[PDB]
Amino acid sequence: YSEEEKYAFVNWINKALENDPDCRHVIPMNPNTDDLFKAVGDGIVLCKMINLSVPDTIDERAINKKKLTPFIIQENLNLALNSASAIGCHVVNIGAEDLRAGKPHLVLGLLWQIIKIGLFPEELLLRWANFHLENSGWQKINNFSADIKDSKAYFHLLNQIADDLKRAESMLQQADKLGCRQFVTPADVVSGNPKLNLAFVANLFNKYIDWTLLEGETREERTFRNWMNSLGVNPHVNHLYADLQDALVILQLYERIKVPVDWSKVNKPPYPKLGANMKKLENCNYAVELGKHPAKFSLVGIGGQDLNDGNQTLTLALVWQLMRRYTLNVLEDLGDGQKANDDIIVNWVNRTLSEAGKSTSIQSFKDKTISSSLAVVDLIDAIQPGCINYDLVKSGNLTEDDKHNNAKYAVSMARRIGARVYALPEDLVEVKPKMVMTVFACLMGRGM
Amino acid sequence: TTALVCDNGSGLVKAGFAGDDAPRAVFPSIVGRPRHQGVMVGMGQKDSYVGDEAQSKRGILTLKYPIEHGIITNWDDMEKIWHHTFYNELRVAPEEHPTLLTEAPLNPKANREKMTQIMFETFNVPAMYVAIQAVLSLYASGRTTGIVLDSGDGVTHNVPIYEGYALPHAIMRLDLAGRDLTDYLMKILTERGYSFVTTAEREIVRDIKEKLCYVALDFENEMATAASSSSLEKSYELPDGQVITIGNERFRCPETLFQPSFIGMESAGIHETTYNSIMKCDIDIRKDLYANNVMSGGTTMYPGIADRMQKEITALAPSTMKIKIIAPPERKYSVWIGGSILASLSTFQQMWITKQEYDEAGPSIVHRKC
Amino acid sequence: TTALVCDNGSGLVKAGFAGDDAPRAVFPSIVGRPRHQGVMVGMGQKDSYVGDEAQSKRGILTLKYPIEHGIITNWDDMEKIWHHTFYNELRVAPEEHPTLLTEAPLNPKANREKMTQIMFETFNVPAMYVAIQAVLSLYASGRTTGIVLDSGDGVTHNVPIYEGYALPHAIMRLDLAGRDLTDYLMKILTERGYSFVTTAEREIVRDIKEKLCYVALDFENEMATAASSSSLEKSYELPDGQVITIGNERFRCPETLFQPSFIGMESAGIHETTYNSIMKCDIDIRKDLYANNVMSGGTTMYPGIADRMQKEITALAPSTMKIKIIAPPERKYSVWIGGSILASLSTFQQMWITKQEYDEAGPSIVHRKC
Ligand SMILES: Nc1ncnc2c1ncn2[C@@H]1O[C@H](COP(=O)(O)OP(=O)(O)O)[C@@H](O)[C@H]1O
Ligand SMILES: Nc1ncnc2c1ncn2[C@@H]1O[C@H](COP(=O)(O)OP(=O)(O)O)[C@@H](O)[C@H]1O
Ligand SMILES: [Mg+2]
Numbered sequence A: 001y002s003e004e005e006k007y008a009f010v011n012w013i014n015k016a017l018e019n020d021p022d023c024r025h026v027i028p029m030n031p032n033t034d035d036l037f038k039a040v041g042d043g044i045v046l047c048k049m050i051n052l053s054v055p056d057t058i059d060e061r062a063i064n065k066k067k068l069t070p071f072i073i074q075e076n077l078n079l080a081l082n083s084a085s086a087i088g089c090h091v092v093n094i095g096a097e098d099l100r101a102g103k104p105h106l107v108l109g110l111l112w113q114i115i116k117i118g119l120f121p122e123e124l125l126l127r128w129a130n131f132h133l134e135n136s137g138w139q140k141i142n143n144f145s146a147d148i149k150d151s152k153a154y155f156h157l158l159n160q161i162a163d164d165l166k167r168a169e170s171m172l173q174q175a176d177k178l179g180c181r182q183f184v185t186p187a188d189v190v191s192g193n194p195k196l197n198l199a200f201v202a203n204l205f206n207k208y209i210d211w212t213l214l215e216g217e218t219r220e221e222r223t224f225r226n227w228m229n230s231l232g233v234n235p236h237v238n239h240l241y242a243d244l245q246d247a248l249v250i251l252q253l254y255e256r257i258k259v260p261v262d263w264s265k266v267n268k269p270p271y272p273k274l275g276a277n278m279k280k281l282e283n284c285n286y287a288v289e290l291g292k293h294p295a296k297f298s299l300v301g302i303g304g305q306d307l308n309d310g311n312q313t314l315t316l317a318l319v320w321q322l323m324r325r326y327t328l329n330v331l332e333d334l335g336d337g338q339k340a341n342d343d344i345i346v347n348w349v350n351r352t353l354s355e356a357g358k359s360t361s362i363q364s365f366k367d368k369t370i371s372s373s374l375a376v377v378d379l380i381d382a383i384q385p386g387c388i389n390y391d392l393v394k395s396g397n398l399t400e401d402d403k404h405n406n407a408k409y410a411v412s413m414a415r416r417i418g419a420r421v422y423a424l425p426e427d428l429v430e431v432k433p434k435m436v437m438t439v440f441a442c443l444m445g446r447g448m
Numbered sequence B, C: 001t002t003a004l005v006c007d008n009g010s011g012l013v014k015a016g017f018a019g020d021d022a023p024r025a026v027f028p029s030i031v032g033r034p035r036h037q038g039v040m041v042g043m044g045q046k047d048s049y050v051g052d053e054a055q056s057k058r059g060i061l062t063l064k065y066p067i068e069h070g071i072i073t074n075w076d077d078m079e080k081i082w083h084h085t086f087y088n089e090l091r092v093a094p095e096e097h098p099t100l101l102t103e104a105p106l107n108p109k110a111n112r113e114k115m116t117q118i119m120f121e122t123f124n125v126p127a128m129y130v131a132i133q134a135v136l137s138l139y140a141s142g143r144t145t146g147i148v149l150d151s152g153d154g155v156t157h158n159v160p161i162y163e164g165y166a167l168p169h170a171i172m173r174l175d176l177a178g179r180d181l182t183d184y185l186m187k188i189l190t191e192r193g194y195s196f197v198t199t200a201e202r203e204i205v206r207d208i209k210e211k212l213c214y215v216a217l218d219f220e221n222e223m224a225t226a227a228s229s230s231s232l233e234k235s236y237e238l239p240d241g242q243v244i245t246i247g248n249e250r251f252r253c254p255e256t257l258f259q260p261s262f263i264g265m266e267s268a269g270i271h272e273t274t275y276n277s278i279m280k281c282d283i284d285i286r287k288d289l290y291a292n293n294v295m296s297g298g299t300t301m302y303p304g305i306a307d308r309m310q311k312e313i314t315a316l317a318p319s320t321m322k323i324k325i326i327a328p329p330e331r332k333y334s335v336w337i338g339g340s341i342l343a344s345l346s347t348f349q350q351m352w353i354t355k356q357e358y359d360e361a362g363p364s365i366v367h368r369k370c
């Protein structure tokens, strides 16, 4: 015969009874176990229900700390069932003698009274669920539990993003596309229980970087362009000697290295047809002026016409000093002051990993153990436990060529967690001590 | 939303939802209370057992039926049973469902008023209705003409209907049913030395009656057969493993339906009561009543009951009439089935007693609307 | 602080704290006094011996038991045993600990009132309670339903329990236990020429009974086996170094439990007493009592006692019932274990008789609280 028929009932009861924070110590934690019948028959949930609005009531260990002997375990059933003033079992027909063992109809319906009186990361994936609520113009629900408190605003925005058993379909319509019908009962869809709407809408939209090599680019050029893209300048810099000619990107970089820019002196990218070359020349002159005096760069024999004309030697003379300044800033802002050091930051990964305990450890940035991404992927989830993601990682079975994939994987999601890594995967695959140190510094930026 | 159909019998409670083909909850209409000393700490602070749970722990309980002869005699235990049927066995909130209740004919008027007050003030159901059980038994058969013989645990009654019209002057009621056959079986079981005396033992005798009793087609021949041979003897095992044997008591118990003098009553049998109900009707409709004798209730489930009623009424009819007995296998739930049919009719939705009407006319509104 | 559990048996005293799994103190319930002239200097200075000191010096003492057949007959010696229990074996101040005492059923009410007065006035306990020994044996086992057979030094009693309810009308009590078996062994040992006549020699015969006696599964062929062959004979060494041998008395002594007529008693055996206790219970609980025969007390430690009870009750039950006897190895301390068990429960901490309650109702408060 049927090995299972009612796990959905366990889920339904959990959904509806999560109104009381402590009821899950008797009813299942939403895994569809059978712990409900015996402890509910003792009436423990009846005294639990007082914790719904005011936790300052009958504590779980104050009523029952197992002062029930190994062989006469009679006592607690009356001590907990006598507390049915809360919610109230209409069915004045049963009680402690029968609920000692329980009965299916009796339990199902006393639970019916329980249901009758029982009711009166996540945001990163939730934004792709709420972006459509803007429509012509309105506030966003975020999760269906925080903003909305009644069906008024919920239905008003549902009109733009389009018996409770049929009303829940109005919200599940966006879930119908991937079959997410069950495990979210209509009672809490309408009531907006928080923890259920968080994970349900987050997991629903979970499925909702340029590492190419050009035909003629050196590693230095690729690193410059990679940090151009990683730093978040508004134009997507593809060619260094073709996008900086307006100096607008350089002025943006100046802001990122904490050099002030007066944009009133800067000619906007919408240049007039007349004099656009002169406007760009003025911008390049201003960029050179901001690079010489306040940025303190050695730019001998460099003028604004050189950046306007894209002189590679003088432009590299500026972008490498930009690297130098930005890296210095990244090393200093981790400190309490102007100090920068490598051995006070290389042991940080070794000691912060002890908070979880994993077999990765590194003696210095020249260690060969960081040739694969194992050390960075180990550190990258220690501060953010929500990004464990050991699906694509390789361990012991990696070769020379396949570790590039896990290196790119770790570098890519480092920006997802919030580490502003501006390193190429090759800079991590090779033991380049001047760049993996920066990778660790950026990971520590979000770390502490 | 969906109307609730609750057929509160004397012995069993039948409950469910309108539109369903069978009642969802069928449990005994009893209340049990402890009869012995509690000695183990906080085992025993439960005061009342009611449903099948009162039947499983009956060895330490005194069992009370809140309904006798179709009259609710304990209104607090009846409230316990209604609470039980709404929340535990049906599992619904009554404030969201109109409720359909049943009742025997010729009953006291205060019984109907009290159940109306209970449904509107204790459960405050949005609407309700009280219907006659034999009328619902006609609905379950799909007919609109025929005489219904309803026999449950406490009351046996006859109601003739023609083309959808009742004849109230020909309605007949007999206060003899299954519970009286149980008590008579207990009385005659002592002739073999089997003694049953507690309310828990009455449930055992009821089980024996439901498993071994039958209606003789000719009582005097079955009596001579049992007096000659043991071929009618049958055995039953008691809950402690004792084995009892009965032969003659198997049919002497249900024979009381045809001979109420066994239990000292002066009333006529169910066959004569049915015939007398037909002879009180217009002579033009008697032919159609003779062809449509509908039985319902658990007491009409004995083997041979339809053959005996067919033969007895044939012996009473003018011979030229064609006697027909209708005895569907679902006889035990015809009242509930007909109540779900009636409560699912769109035309019935304006027959509900609403709470607004009750708030103005009080409990007396049930006599007008029903 | 913590509750004390003192199981004052007839022959042995079991005491300890609630929450422990075994009694901390287990000593004979005796008082010894010198019977010979004090010819050695300094040795005569002690007038009374209580615990194991009375047993080890019994060669120069007369031993008395303050309890016979579960009734305290010497109260000053019982107070000596209680002071020895609290101040020498447990080494606790009774004024700081609630104390749980035990008693047999059907006992005189004055025994329970006097021990309540003794605990509140002589020992000034903050609270106390008196529990039935057979109920505590269920508290020891794993069960809220079952019939308990308790057999210690003075009393054999049966208590049937279902769902934590006792049936007092079915409680049985027999004044035949271990001390009577020892006295019978003393009598039958004279057939081989051994004599034991002083109170010290009674303790020697008790050691022989506890070491060489067993229950025959069939007494008549064991009698024939011992009459033909010698294989049943076993030897025992007396304290002076003499050696005695028994090969028939080993099972004739414990047979008195099943055949009380060996000592002139008219009463039925423990198996028939258990069966009659079950047959006084309601017929709906007998199947659950037949499957739960709990053995308790030191007299239930004979080899083969459970097998013989299984065979005899099976010979009495309706064959369809599954007879089960439960005989845990800790049977000797089931009552004490159950007492420490009950005294630990937080739901029980309001059930204690407090001294303030006793200051109002006097010693009669024990009949209401317990
Ligand atoms: N197979 C059967 N044979 C004989 N009697 C029966 C059988 N089944 C049920 N009964 C009897 O019919 C009654 C069942 O209750 P029911 O017919 O529902 O009456 P009510 O509606 O008043 O509770 C009881 O008296 C029961 O003993
Ligand atoms: N293994 C054994 N075999 C036979 N008799 C025993 C055994 N152990 C104890 N007894 C007897 O049981 C009695 C003690 O049991 P107990 O339950 O302590 O009685 P009480 O509680 O009344 O003192 C004594 O008569 C003792 O001789
Ligand atoms: Mg009925």
Ligand SMILES: [Mg+2]
Binding pocket: C008, C009, C010, C011, C151, C152, C153, C154, C297
């Ligand atoms: Mg004892």
